[PDB]
């Protein structure tokens, strides 16, 4: 990490450099799942069951870790007289491998298709 010519640094980065050079981050998806579903749920006619669904299936601390600090936390951390730490220091959700498709299977039409799909 620290040497002025990064020979061993670049040698340790070949796989991800090659991946991006091939454009596989930007090439359109050639497949997706034909069907998609949300998780199965227990149906139980109690209020405790509904509370538990929110606690586990929409788990606040995991979500807060993935998506990071709220805007007031950023203000309260930045304007204070002394520094303060945040529950996660950052959003811990990874960067998506695909630059345009990201975390969804939604696809959008384009002019390339529009020109070529009429002969």
């Amino acid at each position: 990490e620290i040497t002025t010519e990064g020979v061993l640094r670049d040698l340790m980065n070949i796989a991800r450099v090659k991946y991006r050079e091939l454009g596989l981050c930007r090439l359109e998806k050639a497949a997706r799942p034909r069907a998609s579903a949300p998780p199965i749920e227990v149906v139980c006619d109690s209020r405790s069951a509904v509370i538990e669904r929110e606690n586990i299936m929409f788990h606040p601390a995991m979500r807060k870790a993935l998506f990071g600090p709220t805007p007031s936390e950023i203000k309260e951390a930045s304007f204070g007289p002394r520094p303060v730490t945040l529950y996660p220091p950052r959003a811990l959700l990874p960067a998506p491998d695909h630059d345009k498709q990201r975390f969804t299977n939604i696809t959008v039409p384009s002019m390339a298709r529009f020109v070529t799909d009429s002969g």
Binding site: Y19, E21, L27, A30, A31, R90, H98
Partner: protein, 441 residues
């Protein structure tokens, strides 16, 4: 480094008539096999034919790998040339069938064409705003040619790249807007002196000229297997390199086959069929062969080149023997190319080529003796003695490998036939197939 087939630099055939030259491009003899291989190169280069299985057969040595490696050297860089040792198909990560499916699809290329815009210019100013205690970032780049200057907005990804690259005023940089790659190329003037720790001094460059933007066509070739991996996942494209793919579901591959046909008709992609070379194929089992029977029938099948040393031999996973070690309903799909044992005049030529490739200066007497050894002990053994004799000759500071050095090499290192005699002569002191041995004198 020098390796076993480093001298092989083509197939050694006339491109017009396909006539094999008796020596050319490092290949010697085997003319019928080399002509048959030259015809298979035309089938590959034309690409119109799918799934022809060719078996190179012959006894050990005789150049079955050498011919297949000559073909790889003749196809060049654009065409896929997957090599499998058949033993690679047995896996814990995936079934044998999946391992074959991946190797077939590794052998089909997809040559995508992209148009991209690159910026290139002298950085006149750079400005970055950073939030305290947070991720929020914004910035502006002022960049110049001898003929343009403009101010570009920067996003967070650019600001990360700009600081990773330590972009500073006076730097010459180029930015691929499609990939987002930034590279520096030099500086318009010296690195400013007031600050310490400012890093190594760059190349000098004059300022770029003309327009800041220019368009550039760029071409990428990827396998169908690489497309399979990317599309079976939201995340984890590191599986392209790590293995680690699992058994990819067949409805994903159905979609990719359809979309690649659509990309071809749309003119987005050119499909480039290559070859799967399976080496020592008799290591596959009866389930592998039953799969390959029908994997060959796709219009996306590569041409499959095979090698076998085997006689009539037992098929793996099977009670019974078959020619080449291969089952008959498989061999019904296969044309066979036969390689033959060498003449002494061919051995002399091959050994001369190995000596030249290894940069070893044989005396004519050493070459004659090595040729005689080649007849009696085999081509591989005589080629090993070349390197050995060179070392021994150098230790005695001789200019050339003499018969003295070849004889000492032959004395020090046993050939297989002489090693088998040594084993027979010491059956009591070596451990038997039933584990008995005597350690006493």
């Amino acid at each position: 480094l020098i390796a076993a087939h480093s001298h092989i630099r083509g197939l050694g055939v006339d491109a017009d008539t396909l006539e094999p030259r008796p020596s050319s491009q490092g290949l010697v003899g085997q003319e019928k096999a080399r002509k048959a291989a030259a015809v298979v190169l035309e089938m590959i280069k034309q690409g119109k034919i799918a799934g022809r299985a060719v078996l190179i057969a012959g006894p050990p040595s005789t150049g079955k790998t050498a011919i297949a490696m000559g073909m790889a050297q003749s196809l060049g860089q654009d065409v896929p040339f997957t090599t499998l040792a058949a033993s690679e198909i047995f896996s814990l990560e995936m079934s044998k069938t999946e391992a074959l499916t991946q190797a077939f699809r590794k052998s089909i290329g997809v040559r995508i064409k992209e148009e991209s815009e690159i910026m290139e210019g002298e950085v006149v100013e750079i400005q970055i705003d950073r939030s305290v205690t947070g991720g929020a970032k914004q910035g502006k780049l002022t960049i110049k040619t001898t003929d343009m200057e403009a101010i570009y907005d920067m996003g967070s990804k650019m600001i990360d790249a700009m600081t990773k690259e330590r972009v500073m005023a006076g730097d010459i940089i180029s930015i691929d807007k499609s990939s987002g790659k930034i590279t520096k190329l030099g500086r318009s003037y010296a690195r400013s002196r007031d600050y310490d720790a400012m890093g190594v001094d760059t190349k000098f460059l004059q300022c770029p000229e003309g327009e800041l933007q220019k368009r550039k066509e760029v071409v990428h070739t990827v396998s169908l297997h690489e497309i399979d991996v990317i599309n079976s996942r939201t995340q984890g494209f590191l599986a392209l390199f790590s293995g680690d793919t699992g058994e990819i579901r067949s409805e994903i591959r159905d979609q990719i086959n359809t979309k690649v046909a659509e990309w071809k008709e749309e003119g987005k992609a050119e499909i480039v069929p290559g070859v799967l070379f399976i080496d020592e194929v008799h290591m596959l089992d009866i389930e592998c062969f039953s799969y390959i029977n029908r994997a060959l029938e796709s219009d996306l099948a590569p041409i499959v080149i095979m090698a076998s040393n085997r006689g009539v031999s037992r098929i793996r996973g099977t009670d019974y023997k078959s020619p080449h070690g291969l089952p008959l309903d498989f061999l019904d799909r296969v044309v066979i190319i036969n390689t033959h044992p060498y003449t002494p005049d061919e051995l002399r030529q091959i050994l001369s080529i190995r000596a030249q490739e290894e940069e070893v200066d044989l005396t004519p007497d050493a070459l004659a003796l090595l040729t005689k050894i080649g007849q009696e002990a085999g081509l591989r053994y005589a080629s090993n003695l070349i390197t050995t004799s060179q070392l021994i000759a150098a230790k005695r500071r001789a200019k050339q490998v003499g018969v003295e050095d070849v004889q000492r090499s032959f004395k020090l290192f046993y050939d297989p036939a002489r090693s088998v005699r040594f084993v027979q002569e010491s059956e009591k002191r070596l451990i038997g197939n039933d584990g008995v041995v005597d350690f006493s004198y």
